[PDB]
Design a protein around this ligand. Structure first.
Ligand SMILES: Cc1cc2nc3c(=O)[nH]c(=O)nc-3n(C[C@H](O)[C@H](O)[C@H](O)COP(=O)(O)OP(=O)(O)OC[C@H]3O[C@@H](n4cnc5c(N)ncnc54)[C@H](O)[C@@H]3O)c2cc1C
Ligand SMILES: Cc1cc2nc3c(=O)[nH]c(=O)nc-3n(C[C@H](O)[C@H](O)[C@H](O)COP(=O)(O)OP(=O)(O)OC[C@H]3O[C@@H](n4cnc5c(N)ncnc54)[C@H](O)[C@@H]3O)c2cc1C
Ligand SMILES: Nc1nsc2ncccc12
Ligand SMILES: Nc1nsc2ncccc12
Ligand SMILES: [Mg+2]
Ligand SMILES: [Mg+2]
Ligand SMILES: [Mg+2]
Ligand SMILES: [Mg+2]
Lengths: 305, 305
């Protein structure tokens, strides 16, 4: 059995690709992963996804898309793909001890936000801990918050957040910032931002919501506590391209390269969408858009065979 | 009064840009047009927009996005922009006898589908007449339908539609097809497709829904009637770039050019999204995605000033 299309991933990109491929009668086979639903599964209210005047929670939205894919005939499997063979007319995915094959594959594995790895981080996510100033900065009006990271992203997150927060404490493990000079001088100039170099978070305190962070100096080991009600983590993202490394061309940061404004990868019959590709916008609505394009690309490519 | 951002257009691209710009506290000023709401205002059920397991009508979806923009503080005006001055630090739009100025402008005027211009076409839209095989081909399972056009798009629409329709009659005013050779031989090969060259539609019949088309030979004037229950119009699209011609760089077909995978135009502080730019995918979800990107681009650019 060789399917027309296999989709790997179950965030907005993968489910939108599945909706379009199923409605196009391609009977898509979708491997959602055991941690299915993408990054919105791990948040609370999603307010900037167009179409919901009153907002919708992450899991509610993601279950709408999943049922929508099912309604049109997508075959959804809550299983991880463990290995892929993507070269040639027939592509293979390996799921545990099972194999499945298709003529086209849409890569929609997304990107992981890098975590601090400290107690409280996971429990308090969507409850004071966030990775996305565009998404949640709204909710921290007149509050004291922290941003963690030393790059352009953390610089941009911290400066953006000062239009809501009472104050922004920018925390970084070293005393060198890898951010660009222009980005660095911007938040230096911002009066609502204070830098803490050579500082790490060791724990996030929070009754139901974030109440404080425990800090440690990476040089002296001196510890203290900071009272804050938000923690924005901006220490980078890792595209989930491990499956395809050595098969599809990646950029220096591991994102899947695509041709022009399309979803075509370096391999014939292989298409990529969502935050696996995009290191610029990283929103549900942009990932959904690109999942639609991947399905249209794949359909047109299949027609040319 | 110089606003941070003015948005021109009220389809998915413009309303998604407004949601993001308003939530980012940029107080966007949006000129929706008198025919506001974009192309989905003119359709019935929208089933492939991810997030609605049971579908939603075009006007329902578009009113959700409009109220969503309002909720976050966008200033919406149901007025047409009649002229623009986009060069320089302060951009001007002219609306009748009124002027409004901004530091950044997001162009979201969309693309018009070219119409046959015959009686019944407008009344029967969403009721048997469509411009989008991806959108509505589903609903014509086992029916006899027509596709109008002589280019690659009509070729692609006709071949795609044969996975639903009982038969597809492809109609074109001339006996030369401007479509590529490969596209032309594909539907020639398709057994469900019959060509009618030198033929135009003069009228679409339809009690509540399409029941037939009246035809005329463009050489002899011979007329006849064809019993069909769908009419797919695929005679091209016209991007609504008239406002900006001579100011922003356009491609040979009038689409606004953008840099790389961003929404940046050839003019500083001017960004473009939706079907004004995209001649490839042309879906609500892709237009919404690109409207999000335009607002993120604009915000980042405004921060650099
Ligand atoms: C806490 C948080 C809050 C956010 N809030 C918002 C918000 O309010 N608005 C907004 O627009 N954006 C928000 N985002 C961002 C948005 O969720 C992402 O940009 C978007 O989900 C990207 O979708 P994607 O499909 O590319 O990938 P992902 O969402 O990462 O989804 C990919 C999915 O595929 C699965 N997968 C990966 N590898 C495999 C494999 N080998 N086999 C099987 N399955 C696999 C993953 O487990 C995951 O479930 C938020 C992100 C986070 C982390
Ligand atoms: C009949 C039909 C059915 C469709 N069905 C579907 C479907 O089921 N699913 C799907 O995904 N896609 C569908 N589409 C396609 C989808 O609607 C478009 O791809 C999408 O709306 C593009 O959005 P846009 O914002 O770029 O432009 P548009 O939707 O064209 O919106 C632009 C808006 O801006 C306004 N505007 C333009 N110029 C000015 C000006 N100078 N001043 C003020 N306002 C101005 C216009 O009047 C219009 O209201 C359909 C299209 C049609 C025609
Ligand atoms: N726990 C942390 N505080 S700062 C930082 N930077 C990278 C990784 C972890 C941490
Ligand atoms: N009414 C028509 N039938 S075919 C065609 N082609 C272009 C414009 C109109 C028409
Ligand atoms: Mg995983
Ligand atoms: Mg996840
Ligand atoms: Mg108009
Ligand atoms: Mg319209």
């Amino acid at each position: 059995t060789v399917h027309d299309v296999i989709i790997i991933g179950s965030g907005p990109a993968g489910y939108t690709a599945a909706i379009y491929a199923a409605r196009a009668q391609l009977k898509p086979l979708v491997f959602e992963g055991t941690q299915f639903g993408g990054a919105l599964m791990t948040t609370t209210e999603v307010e900037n996804y167009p179409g919901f005047r009153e907002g919708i929670t992450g899991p509610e939205l993601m279950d709408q898309m999943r049922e929508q894919a099912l309604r049109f005939g997508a075959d959804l499997r809550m299983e991880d793909v463990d290995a892929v063979q993507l070269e040639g007319p027939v592509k293979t995915v390996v799921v545990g001890d099972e194999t499945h094959q298709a003529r086209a594959v849409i890569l929609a594995m997304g990107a992981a936000a890098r975590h601090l790895g400290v107690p409280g981080e996971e429990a308090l996510t969507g409850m004071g801990v966030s990775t996305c100033a565009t998404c949640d900065g709204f909710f921290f009006r007149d509050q004291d918050i922290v941003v963690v990271g030393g790059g352009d992203s953390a610089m941009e997150e911290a400066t953006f957040l000062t239009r809501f927060a009472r104050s922004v404490t920018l925390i970084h493990r070293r005393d060198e910032f890898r951010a660009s000079k222009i980005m660095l001088e911007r938040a230096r100039a911002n009066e609502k931002i204070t830098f803490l170099t050579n500082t790490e978070i060791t724990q996030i305190e929070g009754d139901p919501k974030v109440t404080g962070v425990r800090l440690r100096d990476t040089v002296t080991g001196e510890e203290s506590k900071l009272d804050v009600t938000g923690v924005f983590v901006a220490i980078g993202h890792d595209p989930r391209s491990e499956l395809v490394r050595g098969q599809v061309e990646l950029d220096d940061e591991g994102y899947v390269k695509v041709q022009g404004r399309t979803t075509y990868t370096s391999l014939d019959g292989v298409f990529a969408a969502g935050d696996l590709v995009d290191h610029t916008y990283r929103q549900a609505i942009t990932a959904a858009g690109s999942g639609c394009a991947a399905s249209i690309d794949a359909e047109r490519w299949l027609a040319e065979q």
